[PDB]
């Protein structure tokens, strides 16, 4: 068809200029002349788009298409003397339909200035090696003979090198192997052997609580997850009980020494577990199952304090609403546990070390619950209704958070 601009827009323009009482044939005469000039320029701006080898366009093809038709590039003002603004363009006007049309000059200075990129640089790679396209990141994607393994000996040697580097004898070797896991596109069809190596490892690595072996395997899990190419939820049924035990298990190794390390490992386990519930989500299978196991870990009495601290951390890192609903009716039990560890003279065991960590973590989570959906007031002795664990020091932490909010 031949689509033109509407004539009922051309009469609005004419009567808002001083030219009143225009006929319909006078008004139809305006909207076929200007609709041709739009069609003449958009067909002529198409020349610059096809010769600019882009199709997408950069605000500027219409600026050269106008200059080609001996009409000035600038829009929003027309100079009848032509001399200060010749056919050089001014880049158009950054205007919108949902524009407020009113702005504060001070706000524009307040708004941050964007950074400037490195200048264009030249980088060569390989599309084809003697006919075959390589999988580099610059590329898009009764006697009978014995069977041949689908995995290659380069791939099997790669698996052996990556697994012997990921057990962390040297740190630079680990870090590359972790980046190699994080971005190898062909790491599918090797993924059963990696999942089995992880799963089997943690289970025979908690027989003796070897913390590095576990911290390296958890970093291997994290490096497996952020790889975008591979399909993981076929293997997550082996991945999730491995991270579960890491968080909810006792430490054969004494904790007064690496419990800080152990705590860090638990945090890593709780980070990956929250990611494992963020992805791979279907109805009522994964997130609710680990939530139920965490809550019955919490509810059961006389539970190892290492297991208690790990389950507390796992319950805490589950997001905004989960602590808004699951960390409310239980403060009295937490306080009673802290009081029992405090009473009595035996501190040799790991009980109180576990108690102090649990209380600190629970108190910080309470702080956003106090900040997110409550107003501060009576920060001296009202917390004694919650067994008086953090009290005024908790109030001081809340005040520091308020100061950080003021700085923001």
């Amino acid at each position: 068809s031949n689509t033109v601009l509407p004539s009922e827009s051309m009469k609005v323009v004419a009567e808002s200029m001083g030219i009143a009482q225009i006929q319909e044939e006078t008004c139809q005469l305006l909207t076929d002349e200007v609709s041709y000039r739009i069609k003449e320029i958009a067909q002529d701006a198409l020349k610059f788009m096809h010769m600019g080898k882009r199709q997408k366009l950069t605000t500027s093809d219409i600026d050269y298409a106008l200059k080609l038709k001996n009409v000035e590039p600038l829009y929003g003002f027309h100079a009848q003397e032509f001399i200060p603004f010749r056919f050089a363009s001014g880049g158009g006007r950054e205007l919108y339909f949902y524009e407020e049309k009113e702005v504060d000059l001070s706000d524009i200075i307040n708004t941050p200035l964007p950074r400037v990129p490195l200048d264009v640089c030249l980088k060569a790679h390989w599309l084809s090696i003697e006919g075959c396209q390589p999988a580099i990141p610059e590329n898009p994607p009764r006697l009978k003979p014995r069977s041949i393994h689908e995995l290659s000996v380069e791939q099997q040697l790669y698996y052996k090198e990556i697994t012997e580097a990921c057990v962390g004898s040297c740190e630079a070797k680990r870090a590359e192997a972790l980046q190699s896991i994080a971005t190898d596109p062909g790491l599918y069809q090797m993924l059963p052997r990696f999942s089995t190596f992880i799963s089997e490892g943690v289970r025979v690595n908690v027989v003796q609580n070897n913390l590095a072996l576990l911290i390296y395997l958890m970093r291997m899990v994290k490096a497996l997850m952020d790889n975008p190419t591979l399909y993981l939820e076929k293997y997550v049924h082996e991945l999730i009980p491995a991270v579960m035990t890491c968080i909810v298990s006792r430490q054969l190794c004494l904790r007064p020494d690496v419990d800080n390390h152990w705590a860090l490992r638990d945090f890593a386990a709780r980070l990956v577990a929250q990611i494992c519930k963020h992805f791979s989500t279907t109805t009522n299978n994964i997130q609710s199952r680990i939530t139920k196991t965490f809550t019955k870990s919490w509810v059961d009495e006389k539970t190892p304090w290492t297991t208690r601290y790990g389950s507390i951390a796992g319950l805490a890192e589950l997001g905004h609403d989960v602590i808004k609903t699951l960390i409310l009716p239980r403060l009295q039990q937490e306080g009673e546990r802290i009081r029992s560890v405090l009473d009595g003279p035996v501190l040799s065991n790991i009980d109180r070390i576990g108690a102090d960590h649990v209380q600190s973590l629970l108190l910080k989570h309470c702080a956003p619950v106090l900040a997110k959906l409550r107003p501060p007031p009576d920060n001296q002795d009202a917390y004694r209704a919650e067994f008086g664990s953090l009290g005024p020091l908790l109030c001081s932490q809340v005040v520091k958070a308020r100061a950080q909010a003021a700085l923001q």
């Binding site: 003002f77 100079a79 003397e81």
Partner: protein, 90 residues
């Protein structure tokens, strides 16, 4: 020659527009940064043009303040021979 004596005093005096921004729009048109004092004169000549319009639009706002509108820019640029356009389509 005052303007030669003026430009020789521009090793100091950082102007209102930075030279990383004035020099960017000069490099876009082929003007390359040989002398940094040359950039500061072009940055000063572009300040004085915008400042002379905002100082004359203030006189058209005192008669009708402390607010720059399009109906103040319209008579201010009309003595310059520049017909400013309302948006009218948003």
């Amino acid at each position: 020659t005052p303007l030669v004596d003026f430009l020789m005093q521009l090793e100091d005096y950082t102007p209102t527009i930075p030279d990383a921004v004035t020099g960017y729009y000069l490099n876009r048109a082929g003007f390359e940064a040989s002398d940094p004092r040359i950039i500061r004169l072009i940055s000063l000549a572009a300040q004085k043009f915008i400042s002379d319009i905002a100082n004359d639009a203030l006189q058209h706002c005192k008669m009708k303040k402390y607010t720059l509108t399009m109906e103040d820019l319209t008579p201010a640029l009309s003595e310059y021979g520049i017909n400013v356009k309302k948006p009218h389509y948003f």
